[model samples]
Structures are given as C-alpha cells and as structure tokens.
Target chain A: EHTWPDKGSLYIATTHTQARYALPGVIKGFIERYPRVSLHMHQGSPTQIAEAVSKGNADFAIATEALHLYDDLVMLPCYHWNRSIVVTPDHPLAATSSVTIEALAQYPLVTYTFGFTGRSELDTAFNRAGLTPRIVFTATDADVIKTYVRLGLGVGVIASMAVDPLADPDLVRIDAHDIFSHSTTKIGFRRSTFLRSYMYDFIQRFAPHLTRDVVDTAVALRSNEEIEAMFQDIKLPEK
Target chain B: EHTWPDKGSLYIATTHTQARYALPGVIKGFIERYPRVSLHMHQGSPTQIAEAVSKGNADFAIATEALHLYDDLVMLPCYHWNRSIVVTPDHPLAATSSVTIEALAQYPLVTYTFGFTGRSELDTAFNRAGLTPRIVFTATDADVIKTYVRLGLGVGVIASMAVDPLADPDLVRIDAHDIFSHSTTKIGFRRSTFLRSYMYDFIQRFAPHLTRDVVDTAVALRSNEEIEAMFQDIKLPEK
Candidate 1:
C-alpha cells in the first residue's frame, strides 16, 4: 500500500438540490471522520455538477441524476429511491384517500422545467387518462415552483426530500397513487481519477445505507438500479 | 492652428458590419483631416458596444440601436436615413414598381434579433396585418443572413446600409416602401467625456456629407430628425 500524504485538497461539486439538502449530513459526517483532508464544494444544477467533473473543474460530484453520459466518467450509487407528491391545503380532494393519478388532471399543474427522473410518471399518467393538465407556470428551480403553489399559481410536485411541509406554510404532502413513482441519487467521478484514502473511507461509511438487494426488495426505496428501471418505463412529451 | 502631439490613443468598439462598411470611409476622411491623433478600432455588436461605453472599456462606439436605451450615452447622427429593402434575384416582386407592406406579408420572413434598427419595421408591418410571419431564422448580423440567403435559406429583409448589391451578385434589391424603412447610423460616447480637439474636429468635418439636408434634398434620404423620430416611434417588445 502506498503511504498517504498528510494534507491535500479535494474539490467536490454536487447538484443544487442535493447540495441544499441530502449532502450536508454526509459531508459533515465525512469531515468529522477524516480531519486531515480539506474539501471545497461548488453547487450547481445536475448538468453543471457533471460538467464540473468532465471538464476537470472538480474532482468528484454527487447528483440526483445518473448523468455521467460522457465516456470518461464512472458512476457510483450513494442511496436509493426517494419520492415526492404535489398538494395544496385547499385542494378539494385533500381529505380523501391517497390521491389517484386521475385526480391530477383536474388541477392546474405547476412544476420545474420538465424532462428529468420521474417526470415521465406525470406525462405517462396524464396521457393514459387522455387529459392534458393545464400548466399556467413553469419555474427553473423546484423551490420557486413550491413558492408559486403557495401563492396559488398552481399545484406543485417536488422531490420528497426537497419539499418541507412544516417549514413552508400552506403546503400539504398528499401521496399520489403513482405520481413521483421512482428516482435515485448517485456519487460520480472521472474514470481515471486517483482516490485518496478518506474518499474510500467515506464510501465505506455510506455503503450500509445503499445495499442493492435490500433497497430493491420491498418498495424500491434507496435502490438506484431498481428506481432507474422503473422511471425508464415512463415517457414524456416534447417540450 | 494649435497642433498637439500624436501620443494620445483613442479606442472604439464596433460591430463587424460597421467596421466593414461605414467606419472605413469615415475613418479615412477623419484621418485626412486630423493627421496627429492615433486611433484603434474594436468590432462587436450594439449590446457589446453599449457595455464597452458603460464600463469605460472603449472611448467611443458606433451602433444603430443601443444608444437610445442608454441614459448616460450621448449620441450624434452620422448619416441620413438607412433605406432598407427585401431582396431576391428571381422574385417577380423585384421587377415591380415599389413593393408594398401587403407584398412583404406574402413571403416567409427571416429577421434579425432585437437591438437592431431593422426589427422595428419587421414587427410593425406584421402587427398591422394581425399576422405573425413565420420567422424561419433569426440572426444577429445582416451579413450573416445575406450569406444564408445566398445559400437558399429565404429572401432577407435588411438595412440598406447593411446590404451591398455588388457584394452579393445573386441578390437583387426590391423596394420595400412602407414595409421597410431607414435607421439612423449614430456615433456615441459617455456623457461629459473629455474628447481631444482632433476627435471633435474630425466629427465636425464629416458632419456635412453625412448631413440630412445633403442626403434628403440631393439623395432623397431621411434626416437625423426623421431617424431619431423613427427611433422613438419603434415599439420595443418587453424583455
């Protein structure tokens, strides 16, 4: 084994969504475990996060999308499936049983720019019902869509982790029968990059939560492959 | 005459169109009048030209549309109205007496992006017809569209000053009458900038030929007042 250096810098870029929410806990825990390694973080969208690694802008990236489409990079799983739903407190069907995909056709749709993981679920379900939901507004950021829903622009759908009902007033998270059906979170890097010991140690610490078999078995929660396969079956319309 | 040393340098930013057509002759005449001043030229678009002036990046700029919106910019006329027309060598409309606004509506349009004087005429005619012409392609420069027109994209409506009938042998200019109109070419600087005497003298020297009275009575062209009035008459689309 090669001897490790005492101090070095690591650059990590993560998607804004993950950087704002999921990455904090893992990063904080990793720093505590490895005191000698210094880390720099840059946050951007998934496209920008992946570009950071491809263009030699950053050493590693953690993104919700498995978007290392370029041949030079490798993808690794950090967690499994997570889901979210759209809701409004005054929605007529709010008090009913878990909402069906059919119910979404009745309301005005509000979402971030479409074409991403689990977006096909909305598209597929809407197509099956033979109903095109009225979209009054679209925002670039998920948070902006949530804010629009609060101001009565339309109903907002978001990642379960991204939506905070307690913090954001007037929002209610009602389960959709098949809405937000599947998605995954990934850790990625350039294929030839040399890993420091602390990075491997961090992966090891995160390994227990990302077991493939356990995540795939019951509900597809926290299972990367299973959720991606599920999302692949859905189709969206041309923007 | 109080002769000054040739040590001071003046820099101006311009679009390639102005550099290729208008500035060369203007500079040639100015150089003959002021032999002692050193001058440098930079070429880019009106937006870049305005930015250069605002940032103190350039000493002076010449562009068609940028000066109107910049409150701190002081602009003066260079020439009479720029006669604009739509052209094609083969079209029957090219052989007719002047083309009307109604004739312009018959063909598919190729237009330049906003921040250009040509766009106002394109929009006004389309709006009056309550018809949105199918804009096949939008370009930043008239010369680029001319190249594409030569390549069989579509007949292009362009500023008369931006077009060269001899330069493009394949294109034949058709009178645009009310469908196309002239835009004033103007030179601009930041308000209260202390320009050297030679620079002002050069401008004064060129002012006579570029004079509206000379262009209108002798050349049957629009005046500085007409161009400035047209600049005010143009209704800009909201950003």
Candidate 2:
C-alpha cells in the first residue's frame, strides 16, 4: 500500500504569496498525479511556516523568505524571482522602462513587509545607492501593496510574477529586475524525519532541481553547511 | 522666513491606512488652511514612522501603533479606532453580525504585520480566548490584507476605518469591536524641538484632543509615562 499509494494527507505550511501565487501550478500537478492523497495546507508568515516544518507540525515547508533561517529544516534551492515596481496609470514613474533605486527613493514607497519576501534586497538596493528610501508602507501580500498603490498611496514594489497586466488594467508595472537582487525560493523538510515516497515526488514537482537522489544524499549529511555547500554551485532560474 | 507665513514644508511620517484613509480629511483641511505651508509626507511601517519622528527628520508622526515605543518622541492621543473582520461576501463567516474570537480562530486569518499596526491586539484576543489563529498573511497595509482575502487566502483583520464599502463591494465587514481591543492613533514629536504654530494647528486638526495647550504641556513633561498618564482618560472617537 505504501509503495503505490499512500492514502493519506500531506500537511504543508507556506506563506500567502506562495500559497496564492507561486505553488499552485506544482501543487495542482501533484494532486492530479496522486488523487488518492489529500493536501491540507496552512498559510502563515514565512517564519511561522519555517517553524511549523521544523516542529514536525507540517510535513513540508516552502517559502522564499525565511526558510534559510531554520537550521533544523534542510533546504533545497527552488528558483529565482525578481521584483517589479507598480504605480497608477497616470503616475510619472510608469513611463520608465527600468526603475533605479535612487529614483524610487524620491517618492513615498510601499512594498512588502520585512522578512516576508526578500525584503532585505529592497533595503540593500537603496542602501547601495546611498539613498534612504522613504518607505511609507510595507505589507506581506503583493496584492495589498498593489491595492494601496491603486489608491495613489505610493509606488508598490512586489514580486514581478504576481503582476498580471490583463487583471489589473488600471495600474502600470515597470521592470525592477535590474534594481533589486533576486530572491531564491526553497523547499524545506526536517532532516531527522523519514519522508514518504510521494513527498519526494512532491518535492520534485515543486522544484525540479531537488530530485529524489539529491534530497536523500542531502538528508544523510551532517549539518546545514554541508547541505548548503552541496547546492552552492546551483543557479537560480530567472523569470 | 519662518515667521507667520512659514513658507517651508512640514515633513510628516505615517502609515498607509492612516495616510490613505484616516488623515486625508485632516491633511486636506490643513493644506487649505495653510497653503503657504507645504506638506511632505513619508509613509512607512509604524516602527519606521516612530523612528523617523524621533530622529527629527520629520516634524511629526501619526500612527495607531508603535509611536509610544520611542523614548525621544512625545505622544498625544488622537482618536479611537477599532479592528474589523473582513471576508468575501459569500464566505461562511460573512453572515455573522459580530464574530467571536473562538469563531475567528477556526479560519485562516490575514492581517497586519507584527509591530506595523496594533497586531498585538489580534494576538491578545486569540490568546485570551485560549485559542490560536492561523494568520496566513501579514501586511502593513489593510488593502493588501483585503486583496488576499478576496483571493480566498483567509479572513482579514484590519482597522475598521480602512474599510470603504463603496470602494470594496465584494468584501463583507463584520464588527470585531467587542472581540478585539480598540487602538488609539497618536500624534508624536520630538520633546526637545520647538513647535511651529502651523504644526500645532495641524495636530489640532488631525486630533482634536491634541490641542495646542495640551500638547505644549505634554512636551514640557519629562517622560512618556507622564504624558500617557496625563491623557489616560481620553476617549477616542468611534468612526
């Protein structure tokens, strides 16, 4: 019964952004492949998700932001994603092809709350530019950032993939790929726990780079440094 | 030049909900009353705004949370605002007129980031109920929380003032006033700095309780505790 079908549920903890936007495609595929297995998802801030997986409350955790913080959770690099700047259609910054850190600092800025996504990159981009961005608003959800941006609150900085021009016709999106550093999403699980075969398949579906063999070898390793070093040379996908 | 017609700008730091929803009417009134005194507004998380005002980079800061954290900043009570539960119109919880903490704990929740708003209140509400909430998303802006709520991420807990029924037709608002503790927005400033007449006028307009004489007395006092005790009995307006 365990070999062919594990008629059980997999509890996953992840952030809202990942649950709403990023993980759906992969999760859908996994569900189709294993129709007998149920998926029970719990959403939280990145830290909460990382904690849940570490504590064994959830079988797996996936997040771009705080997965790196937990030493108990073994991490595998997923992919790279960049940030974009959004504003109202009539706003002046909408005309620019690429936004610079310095240019963005001139306005009251709205973006992700610290520690949710790769918010450090936003801080680093501005600090490197020798400018202190007047970040007036910070939210964990990109949609929330966009909502305030639509109200003419300020320019919204969000993960580029969250934007759908067809859906949000009233807003304008500019490429901020060059301005901020890219974030790496990761799949994480406890090193001590014995993962199900289907879980390995789930990881493979979620992140192709994290194949079954790689995960098994990584789990056999001693420390996080070894696990990190194993994937040190891995390149993140750009979108 | 800094006399009657102080033709310089007043730099104020506040949060998005405060900027977009709460302070607009007060700010517009101030602008019209003193056309010569231009306004330069900076938005940030509650902690950021408190820090900005304490550093004297901004003349004043107004937020419902975290302004009292800084030792250098003097705070005056503004008005009373309560948190509301936001859900999709068709959601199960929408039918309830007022929700209980136990009922709220049953669903995936979304709300402000810790330290951004009075997120502590949300925690205390659940903790006191002897229950834990699954806060899937945390945003600095209420709009972002509303966005994910629309996506079916979870129920949103936000400042009631931020809800505009006309603008957000799909979302249903329920009063959580009895379940959650109320928050008071305060006007903050540096104790050592001399206040301008226009700044006093702005404070008075922004928070009727923070009149010129009351503010001047509070500034003369040495510590935040003394100031807090002075306005301990002040009642915030329910909007």
Candidate 3:
C-alpha cells in the first residue's frame, strides 16, 4: 500500500525535450498503475524546472542541467544522454561513416535553443576541439530542428532521443556520442517536502534505481555536494 | 611501451550483428590510432565467435551469447543492448506510443535469425507474457530485415543499434526496449593470450570501464563465474 497509492495530485517540471520524448513511457506506467492520481506537467528551462520544485509549485523536476544550481532541492541522476546528428538521407553528411567534431563544424547546424538540454556542453565540445559551430538555426525542441533539416537548411544536432523512430522516419539519424560529451538527466525535489508513496513510485518508474530508500537517503543528505558523492557508486543507465 | 604498442596484428571473431553494427567505431579508432597494425574480422554464430578466440584463431571475440560455455576465454561486459521494432512509415504499429509484448505477438514479425543477438531474449519476453509471436521471417542481419520491413512484409525486430538514422531513414523505428529483456554484449579473449597495448586500447575504446588493469585482473581470474562476479561491481554503460 505504501508503494502504490490510490489517489493523489502531483506536478512535474521538465524541459520540453524530456516532456515530449523521454517521460511518456514512465508517465503511462504511472497513470495505469494509479489511475486516480492527477498528474500535471510544466515544460521550461532547467532553471525553471528546478525553480518550480524549489518554490513548492511542483513536486518533482527532471532536466539535464541547472538542478545543480538549486541548493534547496535534492537531485538524483536518472540517465546519461548524448547528442546525435540528424539530417535528410540525401544530405552529404549522411553519407559519412563517422560524424566527427570537425565535420559537424563545417555544416550549418540546427539544434536546441541556448540553455536547453545541455546546449552549453555542445558548445564546449566544439570550442575545445578548436572548431566553430555554424548554428544557423535554434529552436526549443528537436521537432523544429527536424523541420528545418528536411528543408535543406542545415544538419540537425539534437539529443539522441529526439530522433523518434516512428514520427521522424524521413530524417536520417547519426550517433554523435563519441563526438560530444554526454549529459545526465536528473530528478530533483525540494529536500523539505514530504514524499508521498506514489511520488516514490513515480521516481522509481522514471528511473528503476531510484527506489524509496535511495530517495530517502538523498533527501536526508545535507547538500548537493554530499548527495553527488553518495551517488558516485550508482551507475545511471544511458538513455 | 606497456600501454601503446606501435605494431601488432589482431584477429576478431564476432557475430554478423556486432560486426555490421557495433564495432565499426571502435575498429575505426583502433586503426587510426595504430595504422600499422593489421586487423581482421570474422563473422559467425556466438559459439563460433567464442571458439575462434578460445582456439587462438582470433585474439578477441565480441558477441552476446555462448561465451559462458567456453572455458578458455575471459568475457568482459561491454554494454547492455535491447531490441527495437522497425516497420514501414505507414504501418499501424508505427503509431503506437507504447509497444507491448501482446501487441508484438499479433504482427507477422521479422527479426534476426534465431540465436542472433538476443533473439532468445525477445522470445522469452513473449513466451513469459503468454503470447505466441508470429515470426514469419528471419534474416542474418538487420539490413535484410530493414529491407523486408520497407516491402511491408512484416515488422522488423532488430537490435536497437541496427536502426541507423543514416542508412535506414525510410523505416519507422519504435523502442521495444521495455518489452524485451536487455542483453549484454561482451568482448572475450583467450585467458592465456599475452596482452598487447593496442588490445587494451581497443577494449577501452569499446567500453571505457574495461581499462588495462581491469582486463589484467579479469585474465588472472579462475573461471567465467569468477569473472562475472568481478564485473558485478563494475557498471557497464548501455551503448
């Protein structure tokens, strides 16, 4: 009974990238398991995702960045994700065997808006590789990037998960896991909030390793520093 | 001298699944990093992949199964992988937000040749779910499956890695990771073979956690069971 609650209300703050792509599976399971529970979703930047939780407007926040800045919340890693190159099948870059950093730099690229889904990490990769990225277009989501990529505007560099197999069958997907650094998406909540039984179940559904005990241990910790140290031994799966 | 050898020839035995899909990136790095080294590849069944290494015909084997049956090789986990379904863009299954085992059992299925990379895992999922899969077709490689999927012959169930965004842009890919149990692809080598610096580099390239010291410790282990125990503590990333 503790793990499965019959009725409750909860809110989750997340990046549009995650809301649109990553959370559907987990949310489906959670709803099917607890049909009486009301689930609300708010999409925003990482800062807003954490802010929603820290300000008591949301119970949980999941995003790849900016959670580390919110001292009032405890963040637990869920999965590691990397960027992938998306393009039209006829595009010259689609013909290449490997999507190297140098090669990506030479093309006009379309990707996420700044501060969305670890765009800074993508910038850091290019800057350190001694290459300049020609980001000709930016959007809040990969769907927009896919739109422009099909129009021959540029190659699309978006989170690997953004390339949905069914909906985006027209676009070509190339893994850039080696060409860029991976970022971890995490689930965070205010340390002071009382976790409902279903809340714990939702976290575990989102990330199997984030069991009730792990959440309790994380919430009881003093700071994000200690929480990070505690999770050093936990291996988060790559999504 | 111990870590980076300039010249050596190495033979790898692998299944068609790994040879065609997984190892190209690692192989590319190994060759560019050590161009003077002669690298050869052999594609076969899991038993053949492990046997080639065990018999010293190959220095290493990368496969998902039958490694535990070979007593003369040490197999280290590289990554966890799962099956993804592929179908023509207009296929009814492509519209599914969630793919269930029961749903999959209804389709005239196309998948890997039986015994190929985690075919058994997919079968187990359906069997345990009390559903009988109607697998009307099979192929030795995913490209062949993708080919048939485009012809609307059947839904293609292939390794998640095989749904390359670049080459197979015409087909819709659906994540069946939830429906299928994940399998681990491992790199195996003869227990008695002398370690070369390039080989260690190749292993690390394939799986970052498998460092020189880790491989040395695994080689010194007594049996596959002990080697498995040694890796239980090491977290393998999903590729």
Candidate 4:
C-alpha cells in the first residue's frame, strides 16, 4: 500500500526523440498526479538508457533501441509508430503517390544511426527489394534526419511522431506507412526490481495496457524470451 | 623526388560532408594520378579525425573541427568557406533578400553538432548578436542540418560549399557571408611523422596554397600556436 506524499525521485532514461516529442504529455500527467515525486530525466541513445536501467539507476527506460538486448530489463510495449518520408518541396520523390523502397534508394539517403529506432527495419526493406540505400548521413533524432533532407542530403526517413505539420511548411511529408514496417517503442525496467504503486500507475499512464497485474507478472517471468512470448498477442497503442 | 607508388594505401579521416562532397573531386584526381595508391577513407566527426591522425593511423585529417586541439597535429590552412542559411522555398525568411542573425533567431534553428565544421562560428554568430537561436536540432553533417531545415526544424547554418543549388531546388540558400565570419577547413597530420612525397602532392593538389614547401615549413614549427603565427598573413585558397 503506497501512501500519498511519500518522497522519492523517479529516474527516467530516454532518447532525445522520446524525451522531446513523445514523453512530454505523459511526463506532465505523471507530475500533476504525483506532485511530491521528484523527477530525474536522463536523455541518451537506447543503448545508454538500457545500461542505466540495467544498473538500476533509472526507474524506467523508454526507447526503441537496445532495451531488448539487456538481459536484466523487462520490456513493456508502449506504442506502435511508423516512419515518414520527408522531402524538400521540389524533390522528384515528393510527386509519387506512394514512395517505393527502390525509388528511395536511387538518391542519397539520410536516416537514423545504425541500431537506433528500428534502423534494421529500414535496412530490411531495402535489402528485400534487392537494392542498396545510398545513406550519406545518419543521426539519432528525427529532426536531425529532416535537417539533412533539406540540404539535398537525400530522402529522410524518420519517426512519424517527430513530424510537426503546422510548424514545417517547407517540408513535404510523404506517408511511409506502406513503405517501411511499423516500429515499437517500449518501456523497460529491471526484471527483479519491485515497482511501487506509483511506478505502476506511471506505467499505466504512459501505456494504458501496462497495468499493475500485467507488469508484476511480466517482471516475475524468468527470461526475456518468456516475457516476449507471453505478451506476443498484446496490441500496441497506435501513435 | 618520389617514384609512382607500386602498392600503398592512403588513409584519410574526415567528416561526412568533406568525405561525400568536398573530397570526391580531389580524391578522383589523386587516384587518377596515382592509381596504384589505393584510397581508404574513414569518416567521423572532426575530433575523431584528429585523434586518428594523431595516432598515426591516418595519413591525413581534413575537416573544420578540432584539428588544432591535437598537440601532435601539424595543421595547414586549406581554404576559406562561409556558411549559408537554407530555408524552405516558402519560408518567410526565404522572401527576404538578406537575413540577419536577429531575424533568424525568431524561429527555431537547426545546425551542425558542437564540434563539427565550424559549429563554434555558428555559436559565435548568434552569441555576438546577443540572441540565442532556438536550435531545435544539431547533427554532424551539413546534409543532416539541411534535412531538418526542410522540415521546418529551423533555418540551417551550414558550410557554403555543402549546398548544391542544382540538387536542392526546394531550398533557397541565403548567403550568410555578410552575417557570420568565414571558417577555414584545414588539413592536419602528425608533426613528427614523415609524409610520403605523394602525400605532399595530394595536399598541394587539394589546396594550391598548401604547396610542398609551405607544408614542410609548417610541419617544422614547434607548436600549433606558433604555426598559426607563422602563417598569420597567408591567404587560403577560395573554395
């Protein structure tokens, strides 16, 4: 029975994309619900976040990369999101109704850094099509990927959540929903660590599907493979 | 006098923009002249390139970042280049004939990573204007910066030569020459390391001002500061 007004700092490790664009609303809601709870936010690549979580320094880790690689961390699917193709207004690819992987490979490509944000999916798409993407530049942030797209770096493939339509009139956003496979962002914590009521509440607030019972059962599971198999049928929330 | 190479490799460390855009022509020329001298290029941030050169792993390091910070490196000024502001063709700033740093600060900005390709000069520009740019994103490559600028990440401040007007029809390039100070890209090598005659020829080919004599004298200098003082009035070749 966790009581109100109990003081504790909640540490969250996340990537810049999630920290800046995706988690703000969830964070705000958490803060409002638990005013007494001090929050310590650390931003880094997914691997770094997983490292922080593995060490038990961070109460939670939310990112698309490297969390699954950590044996000590139990992951809960947070959401399903797709990548978007952003091009300069006059780019020839901008005219296509549906962007094909082959077309994207024809020019220089700018996308995520390797091992970040399901970059493997992107590689798979190009590889399946029997083509090699001429990726000239890569960055961890969707915004960074978009920045190079403007410089004629090539086409930019980035997370859809990173796009701010009203703010970016200069860019033409093409739906890459049909082009690239959807990616899942997950929330993770140490498998053996006991979470407080508030922590469970925080997880629920971030991902409605992750209730106390679900989280507890998942954490109690012996291995990552078992946890993954148990939740194989769970549907991720749409972005 | 050095005979044509029977078999050897030239390892150059540079940033993405330099490796992709600036060095290609020079590399082509070098390879044609010395076909037997296989080229092996390593791409990374400026500091990384400097580290590689200092370790004697790379024959040369050419970039705009951190070359001077290495004690073992002998830096030779290669060329002078200014940065340009890239905006989406429809951006309000695109309508202006000349853009001010103050005007640019009104919107979000996207630019280079802290140490890559004269990022400090970009910092100095906004700092001197007494206005903090709303830099929403930063990346190591000019292409990455421009990609987001296309998405309205913000106006992009990037090396002038990185812009390919023919390729980026959607981007309107504004000469930031009148606003920000020009930055110099330099070629660096280990001070104590002996360079092959072909390496000297390669340097001269890349930058006419970096003649073998100029490089020899610069290499003999005791320190970086002394080298800078020695070439204080020397003119850099225009890109």
Q: lDDT per model, in order?
A: 0.57, 0.75, 0.75, 0.73
Question: Please, what are the lDDT tens digits per residue for candidate 1 over residues A1-239?
Answer: 34344466667766435554565566656655555565555544466667778998788777655463542455555554544555677776566767676776677666543434345555666777787876544333455456456555457776666677675656787655355445656666665677666666555455444234423331323333454464444442110
Say which prediction, candidate 2 or candidate 3, comes out ahead on DockQ.
2
Kindly indicate the candidate among 2 and 4 with the higher DockQ.
Answer: 2
Off by over 4 Å in 3: A1-5, B1-239
**Every candidate's TM-score, chain A alone:** 0.74, 0.91, 0.93, 0.92
Q: Which candidate is the best by lDDT?
A: 2
Q: Which ten residues in a row have the lowest lDDT in candidate 2 chain B?
A: B1-10
Strongest candidate by TM-score: 2
Docking class of 4: incorrect
Interface RMSD of each: 23.0, 6.2, 18.7, 8.6
Q: Which digits, one per residue and each the tens of the lDDT, describe model 2 over residues B55-94?
A: 7778888888577557678777777788888898898897
TM-score attained by model 1? 0.43
**Model 3: how far residue A172 lies from native, Å:** 1.5
Weakest lDDT window of 10 consecutive positions for candidate 4 chain B: B144-153
Fnat of the models, one by one? 0.00, 0.04, 0.00, 0.00
lDDT of 4 by residue, B47-96 (tens): 66788888787778888746766767777777788888889888998787
- Which should have the higher lDDT, number 1 or number 3? 3
lDDT of 1 at B113: 50
- Name the lDDT value of residue A61 in candidate 3: 85
Worst ten in a row by lDDT for model 4 chain A: A144-153
> What does candidate 4's lDDT look like per residue over A72-121, in tens digits?
77777788889888899999987776747777788767677667778888
